[PDB]
Amino acid sequence: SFKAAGTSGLILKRCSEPERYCLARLMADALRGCVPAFHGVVERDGESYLQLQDLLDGFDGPCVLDCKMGVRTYLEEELTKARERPKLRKDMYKKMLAVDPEAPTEEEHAQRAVTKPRYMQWREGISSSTTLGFRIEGIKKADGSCSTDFKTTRSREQVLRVFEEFVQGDEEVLRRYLNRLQQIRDTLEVSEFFRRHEVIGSSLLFVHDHCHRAGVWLIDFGKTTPLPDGQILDHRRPWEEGNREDGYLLGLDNLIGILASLAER
Ligand SMILES: O=P(O)(O)O[C@H]1[C@H](O)[C@@H](OP(=O)(O)O)[C@H](OP(=O)(O)O)[C@@H](OP(=O)(O)O)[C@H]1O
Ligand SMILES: Nc1ncnc2c1ncn2[C@@H]1O[C@H](COP(=O)(O)OP(=O)(O)O)[C@@H](O)[C@H]1O
Ligand SMILES: [Mn+2]
C-alpha cells in the first residue's frame, strides 16, 4: 500500500476510509504522539493517499518489528458475512494443510476452501494472539534481511526469544522500548479515542538502530471502528461475539511483561 512522497521525511499510504477517519481523530487525541503524524490526503495516479510521517526517517539503518495487537484479528461483521453469504478462499485453505494437515475439516478439504473468520481464528490460535493478545508478524533488518516466518510463534518464551534476537543485546534499546511501551499504555488508558473504538488489526511498530535510537508507534487503523453511541470497551476482558472486545490491553500488558523479563535475563 506504500509509495514515496515528494517531501523529505514523509511516506504515502493508499487511502482507506476507516483509516483516514481514525488518523484525523488521533491527531487531536491523547494518542497523537503514539502514532505517525497524519498531514492530510493527496492525489497521485488519480489515486488518493494518506500523507504520513515516515517513522524510519531519523534512524540510521533501522531494524523494524511489527507486532499485530489484539486477541481478535477480524471484525464481528465478518462473522455475520460468513454465515449469511460465505466466500470460500482457496488460498486461506492451502496454508492450513502446510502448517497443520489435520487442521481443515473433512468439508473444508472437499471445498479446498475456508471462510475468513475461520482462517483468522486458526492463525490466532497457532500463534500467540489468542493466549497473549498479540503476535509478531515480521522483522525487517538493517542487514537487508526480512522475515515473516512467525506463524507458530506462540509461547511466552518463543516470543521472548524473537525479541532477544531482534535487540541483539542492546540494553539501551530494550530500556527505551520498555519506557515507550509504559508511556503508551498510560496514554491508551486515558485516551478518548481508545475507549470509544474497537481496535482490530493494528500493530505496534518497533524501530531501533545501531546508535541506540528506539521508538514504538501504533499503526494500521484500517479495521478500527467506533462503538455504537456512548458504549466503551475495557480492552482487557475476553471477546465474546456481541461485546466487540479486542483484548488490545491484555496484549500490551503481556508484551510489557515479556520485555521486562527479557531485560532481567
Ligand atoms: O497474515 P495472513 O495470515 O496472510 O492473513 C492476512 C492478514 O491477516 C491481513 O491482515 P494484514 O493486512 O494486517 O496482514 C488480512 O487483511 P485485512 O486488513 O483485509 O483483514 C488478510 O485478509 P484478506 O485481505 O481478506 O485476504 C489476511 O489474508
Ligand atoms: N508511517 C510509517 N512510516 C514508515 N514505515 C511504515 C509506516 N507505516 C507502516 N510502515 C511499514 O509498512 C508496514 C505495513 O504497514 P501497514 O499500516 O500495516 O500497511 P498494510 O495494512 O497495507 O500492510 C509496517 O509493518 C512497516 O514496516
Ligand atoms: Mn497490516
UniProtKB/Swiss-Prot annotation:
GO-annotated molecular function: ATP binding; calcium/calmodulin-dependent protein kinase activity; calmodulin binding; inositol hexakisphosphate kinase activity; inositol-1,4,5-trisphosphate 3-kinase activity; small GTPase binding
GO cellular component: cytoplasm; cytoskeleton; cytosol; dendritic spine; glutamatergic synapse; nucleus; postsynaptic actin cytoskeleton
Residues with PTM Phosphoserine: 1
Alphabetically ordered keywords of this record: ATP-binding, Calmodulin-binding, Cytoplasm, Cytoskeleton, Kinase, Methylation, Nucleotide-binding, Phosphoprotein, Transferase
Uppermost EC category: transferase
Localization, UniProt: Cytoplasm, Cytoskeleton
GO biological process: actin cytoskeleton organization; cellular response to calcium ion; dendritic spine maintenance; inositol metabolic process; inositol phosphate biosynthetic process; modification of postsynaptic actin cytoskeleton; phosphatidylinositol phosphate biosynthetic process; positive regulation of dendritic spine morphogenesis
Effect of residue 220 to A: Loss of kinase activity
Reactions it catalyzes: 1D-myo-inositol 1,4,5-trisphosphate + ATP = 1D-myo-inositol 1,3,4,5-tetrakisphosphate + ADP + H(+)
Role of this protein: Catalyzes the phosphorylation of 1D-myo-inositol 1,4,5-trisphosphate (InsP3) into 1D-myo-inositol 1,3,4,5-tetrakisphosphate and participates to the regulation of calcium homeostasis.
Annotated protein name in UniProt: Inositol-trisphosphate 3-kinase A
Species lineage: Eukaryota, Metazoa, Chordata, Craniata, Vertebrata
